[PDB]
Assembly symmetry: D2
Homo-oligomer: 292 residues x 4
């Protein structure tokens, strides 16, 4: 499933930074019960940056196992070297995942033509559906709509997570691609606007802690009841902003811990513990959402 | 040596995309003869992003052996995961490299406190001199002068490659650190200005193909003879700019091949072959510089 | 009328730069026949910058006279000194205009509190409805939603022309103001998106030359037929962009001349004649729109 | 004189918002005694935006008479309409001012060709020396070095006040113009760096309240004694920054009043009184500078 509220799930860790199975199970049970459409495992919010490919794979397999068919799982598979992205993708073939979320190469700043060849080659060497992921603030490059349109012609490139926060992109992309190509927001604070403009859902950080509200908001939005959805969004808006008051996923892991959904808020360096000021900002956002 | 013209050297490759030993030797001899003060091996211009850590270590060791004590070699050791940066740094402990060039974590956007804990841990796991590297347009994050001052108090952290193109940083950093701390431009087009403000040199892309002029420009600059250094800078300014007409190192590798310095201009995806129009652009800038 | 397609009308000039009555009449007849909701007289596209207050007033009175009750007229009245904005506003009291379009002070970069006091004082000393105008790219300041919300409580501040091109502003403002406060796009290329998000119309440069299409697009948008409206918008999109290929109103005045709607494309300095390249770009956009 | 520390002088006002003659005389005496090289009368810091042209001419003439041949006076003559800039310039022909400081048209965003025709026409209607003024954050447009080179060939255009804060412009402009062409910082915080790169001085806001230190800093800089100039710059750096904590000239006028240099800190709307928090911020920076 590539529609509705999709959680960009945290990788819960113990005090030594290793995946905590008991916390992860609890989160998955929570998403099943709360009506989340799918789980992105080991994307950016899941600390893909600081797990090696072995641990990355373990977490995705553990997520599949615990999910036990009750909720679809999409694996993060992005890399800034095309050969590495292919290799990582091969690790998940015939695993049970329903798709992959794959980011524009970060740091090395390829051209549009380079981005096109990068994703075409990934797509060629798998049967798994691919969701492109654009986030220039993190990567230093910007997959423009024209190039998205070229890539949408590839059979198994089926959608895009668009995280510019630039809402003009929704209809620039939409007019260049087929009606079943999926447009997903990657920016929680502008996500309802994104859907109102024609987007089909959101890959969401807020959904980690407000899963039920997020699920209802996205369904109301898909039904065209945008005013009914804005009431919920307005409740969630302090969360949409303050979950990024310190680098993601520091705030959301703290929030998960405060709610009792995970055992510890431990991250891996270069992420560092939440400051006390961040604590009180996030706690106030959780209260505004009605979660504490 | 952490002063004068330091080349951010390309990793020349055969048509298969693997390191070409004869081309690399030719490049190193060229830098020895040209007066280049040091080599950065497998930094960004050397395609650190598309080489695995074993391949990257093989290229550093091969560059060191080929230099044969004639020119100091600095290893690129950057990673966006701290444990991974330590691990890569440790491959070079007691190897003969004189120091490491280590970038701010890219993509995961750490806070200033995160940047501090990252570089500090790295420095504590090595005896090698560490040069910080700040390049916000590639990384999505910006190591501010205040934090550079903090890290400069670590015995082992001895300078910064500053690639913002924002020349105010030279004296903001200088007043916060000791006189022994080295300040290096990471932006060829503004590097002479950077030295005129008190910078000690440049880690240069232009130097790959104009090593003699670059060495002489930096020597004049260190001596305070700025007007004569500008005459060289003006010859070189089209290269400073046009070597980024397409994503680096696509232009510089083609220019190396055109000058007979390397056998092929092959790169790894997501870098792609230079376009015809970029070919003509770089040819004209080489001509302007008097090289072709 | 402050809803639908509102033309930011050109001030047609003869060869000496003086208002051309015959061309202006033709334009007004054209807007009456084409279903334009209203005319903004002597706003930015009408060269408010280069007419003095006497000429400014003459053009607005001439526009009223020629309009002859058939179409409502809104006068541009903005100034970067509060006392000048008041004085200019007093010139139009009891003139027949239905409202004023008043820009954030440009150049002097006041604070939010300053912007609040600026517009409150203007509003206090007239009965005429006021439409706030935010356009940071031109002014160097940005009237934020919070401050719009404070100003909306003033009886006769009735709406805003929002020209950031940042579509998140629509619902940020809307939730802070009453349901009859009017939200108008000031950015043609993102205007349909703006209306789809809840905006009530557009103060438009494209409407100078594609009035009928613009009127229909805005009505379809108000009725919720967004797909039907996008077909028209897609026809107009090259115009929405290329009318700004050179500084507005240079392209649109040329376009008006090519269509025969005005006698000359003359502007006042520092606007200069369209280049030949601009000519062919704009002509191609007019053809794509089906106007030539 | 178009060299050294040139003050962008406030227009001190009584509580009614009109020019206060006793405060202005006190300021001019202060600059004569302090070693300030020249006064810019009714530039931006002098509230050119909120004074009509008659009031602005009255203040320039009063500043000239009070200077009584002891210190050269430069008139601000900027306007975004070319005919208006000419008219204002002509008020000062044969008046005793030594030159004009004239800004790129703000708000109407002319092309580079427009900027060329604007400044050229102005220069042709006067015998007075003209200093160009580029400040893109206020004006919405950017006079590039290439165009500065073009205008410098006009006999009458003799320098530029560069307020981008982008220090690369110093040598981009310098290589395109003759050695007689003057380069002046318009950004106090980067002005010493600007002079170290070959700049000839600064038109300064800081100098309003720290005229002695500024004159001495610029004198040391012209002599090449940069390290000793930095010691002064560091004393002054909190002012360089905090004098813009609220929109200029709100902070500098309050600081003038606190030092007993003017009778009131009154400004014209849309500038508003300094906040309590800004009061405390500016007080601390004055203390740091050793003035209070």
């Amino acid at each position: 499933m590539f529609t509705g509220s999709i959680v960009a799930i945290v990788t819960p860790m113990d005090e030594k930074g290793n995946v905590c199975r008991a916390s992860l199970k609890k989160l998955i049970d929570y998403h099943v019960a709360s009506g989340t459409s799918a789980i992105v495992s080991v994307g950016t919010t899941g600390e893909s940056a600081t797990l090696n490919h072995d641990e990355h794979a373990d977490v995705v397999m553990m997520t599949l196992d615990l999910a036990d068919g009750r909720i679809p799982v999409i694996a993060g598979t992005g890399a800034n070297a095309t050969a590495e992205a292919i290799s990582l993708t091969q690790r998940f073939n015939d695993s049970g995942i329903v798709g992959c979320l794959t980011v524009t190469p970060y740091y090395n700043r390829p051209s549009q033509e380079g981005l096109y060849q990068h994703f075409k080659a990934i797509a060629e060497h798998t049967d798994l559906p691919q969701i492109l992921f654009n986030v220039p603030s993190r990567t230093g490059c910007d997959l423009l709509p024209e190039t998205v349109g070229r890539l949408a012609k590839v059979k198994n490139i089926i959608g895009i997570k668009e995280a510019t926060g630039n809402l003009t992109r929704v209809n620039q992309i939409k007019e260049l691609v087929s009606d079943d190509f999926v447009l997903l927001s990657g920016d929680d604070a502008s996500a309802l606007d994104f859907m109102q403009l024609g987007g089909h859902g959101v890959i969401s950080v807020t959904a980690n802690v407000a899963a039920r509200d997020m699920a209802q908001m996205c369904k109301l939005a898909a039904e065209g009841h945008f005013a009914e959805a804005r009431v919920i969004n307005q409740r969630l808006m302090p969360l949409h902003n303050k979950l990024f008051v310190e680098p993601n996923p520091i705030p959301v892991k703290w929030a998960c811990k405060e709610l009792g959904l995970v055992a510890t808020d431990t991250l891996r360096l270069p992420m560092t513990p939440i400051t006390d000021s961040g604590r009180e900002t996030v706690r106030a956002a959780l209260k505004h959402a009605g979660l504490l």
